[PDB]
Amino acid sequence: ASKRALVILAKGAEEMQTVIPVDVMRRAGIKVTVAGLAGKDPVQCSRDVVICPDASLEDAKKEGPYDVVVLPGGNLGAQNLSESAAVKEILKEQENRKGLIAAICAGPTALLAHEIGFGSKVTTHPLAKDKMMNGGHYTYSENRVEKDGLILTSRGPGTSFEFALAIVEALNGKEVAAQVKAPLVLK
Amino acid sequence: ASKRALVILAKGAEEMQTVIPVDVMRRAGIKVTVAGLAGKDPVQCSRDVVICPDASLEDAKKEGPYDVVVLPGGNLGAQNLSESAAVKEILKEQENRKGLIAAICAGPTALLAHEIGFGSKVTTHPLAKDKMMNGGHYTYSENRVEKDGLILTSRGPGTSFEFALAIVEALNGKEVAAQVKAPLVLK
Known part of the structure; x- marks a missing residue:
C-alpha cells in the first residue's frame, strides 16, 4: 500500500513550492495528485510558470481521502486557497480524520483563514x-x-x-x- | 536593458531544474523564455509534472540571441536535448557569439553530444x-x-x-x- 498526497494548485502559487514537493514525494513512491483549485485547466503560477494539473479539485476530492494535503505558498495562491469553500471543506475533513496537513511560505495563512490547527506551533x-x-x-x-x-x-x-x-x-x-x-545532491 | 534567458524544455526534463532556474531568473528581472523542444505543446517532465512552454524552440530562436541558454537535467530530457539538431545549432551559435551556456545534472551531457565547450572544467x-x-x-x-x-x-x-x-x-x-x-530563505 502506497501513501497518497493531494497538492492544491491555485493561480499565483509559488511554482517551486508546488514542483519540489510533488517531485520529491513521487521519488518517495507517494501517489501524488496535483489538483487545480479552479478546474482542470492550466495554472499560471506566481513567476508565470504554467502547470497542468492532474485533475480538478472537485474530482480529486472524490478520490480521497489522502494521507497528506499540501498547500504551496505564493501570496496570491495562498489567498485563493484561503477564499475557497472547497479548500475549507477538504481541510476541515482532513483535520477531522486526523490526517496530516502541510503548508509552506504563505500557505499556512490558509490554515488561519479556515480556522485549521489552532493551538499549534507553526512557521x-x-x-x-x-x-x-x-x-x-x-x-x-x-x-x-x-x-x-x-x-x-x-x-x-x-x-x-x-x-x-x-x-x-x-x-x-x-x-x-x-x-x-x-540522489538530490543537497548540501 | 534586461538580460534574456532561453530555457530548453524537453520531455523527461527534471521539472525542479526547469522551474527553479526559471523562477529565480524571473525574480532577478531576467526575461526568460521557456521553449519547448518538440513544439508549443505541454511537456511531461521526469516526475510527471506537466509544464506549458512559453513558445516552441523554433519560434524562440527567431527572437534571440539570448544572454544565457539553460539546459535542465533529467536523463531522458538530456538525451532528447542531445539528439536534437535544433539544440546543436542553438548551442553552436551561442558558443560562437561568446554567450553563456548553463547546464545542470545530466544536462551537461548534451554539451558533450554537440561538442560544446571542450577543454572546460565541468560538473x-x-x-x-x-x-x-x-x-x-x-x-x-x-x-x-x-x-x-x-x-x-x-x-x-x-x-x-x-x-x-x-x-x-x-x-x-x-x-x-x-x-x-x-527572500528565498536559503540556509
Whole structure:
C-alpha cells in the first residue's frame, strides 16, 4: 500500500513550492495528485510558470481521502486557497480524520483563514508572520520546518526540499526519506 | 536593458531544474523564455509534472540571441536535448557569439553530444560523470556549481538554487544575486 498526497494548485502559487514537493514525494513512491483549485485547466503560477494539473479539485476530492494535503505558498495562491469553500471543506475533513496537513511560505495563512490547527506551533515565510499571527491563534517558530503533530509548516522556496522530505518522513519513514535525499545532491 | 534567458524544455526534463532556474531568473528581472523542444505543446517532465512552454524552440530562436541558454537535467530530457539538431545549432551559435551556456545534472551531457565547450572544467550529477567524461574532453569537478568562463554547470536538484543564482550573478551581478537570494530563505 502506497501513501497518497493531494497538492492544491491555485493561480499565483509559488511554482517551486508546488514542483519540489510533488517531485520529491513521487521519488518517495507517494501517489501524488496535483489538483487545480479552479478546474482542470492550466495554472499560471506566481513567476508565470504554467502547470497542468492532474485533475480538478472537485474530482480529486472524490478520490480521497489522502494521507497528506499540501498547500504551496505564493501570496496570491495562498489567498485563493484561503477564499475557497472547497479548500475549507477538504481541510476541515482532513483535520477531522486526523490526517496530516502541510503548508509552506504563505500557505499556512490558509490554515488561519479556515480556522485549521489552532493551538499549534507553526512557521511561515518571515513576511507572512504578521498575517499568520493575527489573533495569536498559533505559536510562531523560526525553524525551517516546523511539525506540531499533524500540522507541518515551512518557510520559503529555499526550505522546500526540507519541507518535502519532512512530509516523506512523516508518511514513509526516516529510511525512505534518507534514500530519496541522497540522489538530490543537497548540501 | 534586461538580460534574456532561453530555457530548453524537453520531455523527461527534471521539472525542479526547469522551474527553479526559471523562477529565480524571473525574480532577478531576467526575461526568460521557456521553449519547448518538440513544439508549443505541454511537456511531461521526469516526475510527471506537466509544464506549458512559453513558445516552441523554433519560434524562440527567431527572437534571440539570448544572454544565457539553460539546459535542465533529467536523463531522458538530456538525451532528447542531445539528439536534437535544433539544440546543436542553438548551442553552436551561442558558443560562437561568446554567450553563456548553463547546464545542470545530466544536462551537461548534451554539451558533450554537440561538442560544446571542450577543454572546460565541468560538473554533473555524480551518476552522469562517466557519460560526460567519455573521451576526456572536459576536466571534472565536484563543486556544486562550476563555472569555467562561458560554461556553467551544476550537479542536481539540490544544487538548483545555487545554479540559478550563479546565472543571475553572471548576468546581473553579485548585488542582484544577493538581493534575490535573501527572500528565498536559503540556509
